[PDB]
Amino acid sequence: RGSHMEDFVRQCFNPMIVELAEKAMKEYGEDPKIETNKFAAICTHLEVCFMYSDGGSKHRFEIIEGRDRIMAWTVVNSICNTTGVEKPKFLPDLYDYKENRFIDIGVTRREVHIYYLEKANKIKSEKTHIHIFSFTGEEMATKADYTLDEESRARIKTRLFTIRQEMASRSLWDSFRQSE
Ligand SMILES: O=C(NCCOc1ccccc1)c1nc([C@@H]2CCCN2C(=O)CSc2ccccc2Cl)[nH]c(=O)c1O
Ligand SMILES: [Mn+2]
Ligand SMILES: [Mn+2]
Structure with missing residues (x-):
C-alpha cells in the first residue's frame, strides 16, 4: 500500500535524509x-x-x-569522558563544543511550550539544552539561550513553513497536524 505522504516525503527531502530516516525507523x-x-x-x-x-x-x-544507536552512544561517551559533561539519560541530537552542552532539537505542531514541558520532564537531565521549533515560526530554548544567531534560526523556520505549505497544498497537512 502506497500513500500520497510517502511519495511526497521522497520528493521533498534529499535522499541522504530519506535513507537515514528509513534506517532510523x-x-x-x-x-x-x-x-x-x-x-x-x-x-x-x-x-x-x-x-x-x-x-x-x-x-x-x-x-x-x-x-x-550504538555509535551515537559511543560518541556521547567520548564527549563525556573528554569534557566531564554529565551523561544524558536519553540520546541528544548535537553537542555544542562552544557552549559545552548537549542539545535536543524539537519540531512540533503544538504550542512550543506544551511540547517543551514534555521534552523537559521526559529527559529530566538538567544539563541537556533544549531548542524547540514550531511549524508556525515560533521557537523556544532553555534559559532563552538560542545558541545560534537569528539568521541561521530564521532559515530553519522558513524551511519548516515551506514543508507545511507543500503538505497543505497536497491535503496532507491536516492528517499530519492531527497525528502528533
Ligand atoms: O532522538 C529521538 N528519539 C530516538 C529515536 O526515536 C525513534 C522512535 C521511533 C522511530 C524512529 C526513531 C527523539 N525522539 C523524539 C520523540 C520523543 C521521544 C520519542 N520520539 C519520537 O518517537 C517522535 S518521532 C522522532 C524520532 C526520531 C527523531 C525525531 C523524531 Cl520527531 N523527539 C526528538 O526530538 C528526538 O530527537
Ligand atoms: Mn534525537
Ligand atoms: Mn530531537
Whole structure:
C-alpha cells in the first residue's frame, strides 16, 4: 500500500535524509510505508538538525542524531569522558563544543511550550539544552539561550513553513497536524 505522504516525503527531502530516516525507523521496528506521518516527522527533524549544525562555525557541533544507536552512544561517551559533561539519560541530537552542552532539537505542531514541558520532564537531565521549533515560526530554548544567531534560526523556520505549505497544498497537512 502506497500513500500520497510517502511519495511526497521522497520528493521533498534529499535522499541522504530519506535513507537515514528509513534506517532510523527500521532500527526501532517501524515501517515508513505504513507510519507515513512519522516518516515525514523524522525526515523533518533530521533536516533541522543538519541545518542547525550548519549554523555555527566550521567544527562547533558534533552531530549525534542520524547515527545508529550504538555509535551515537559511543560518541556521547567520548564527549563525556573528554569534557566531564554529565551523561544524558536519553540520546541528544548535537553537542555544542562552544557552549559545552548537549542539545535536543524539537519540531512540533503544538504550542512550543506544551511540547517543551514534555521534552523537559521526559529527559529530566538538567544539563541537556533544549531548542524547540514550531511549524508556525515560533521557537523556544532553555534559559532563552538560542545558541545560534537569528539568521541561521530564521532559515530553519522558513524551511519548516515551506514543508507545511507543500503538505497543505497536497491535503496532507491536516492528517499530519492531527497525528502528533
Ligand atoms: O532522538 C529521538 N528519539 C530516538 C529515536 O526515536 C525513534 C522512535 C521511533 C522511530 C524512529 C526513531 C527523539 N525522539 C523524539 C520523540 C520523543 C521521544 C520519542 N520520539 C519520537 O518517537 C517522535 S518521532 C522522532 C524520532 C526520531 C527523531 C525525531 C523524531 Cl520527531 N523527539 C526528538 O526530538 C528526538 O530527537
Ligand atoms: Mn534525537
Ligand atoms: Mn530531537
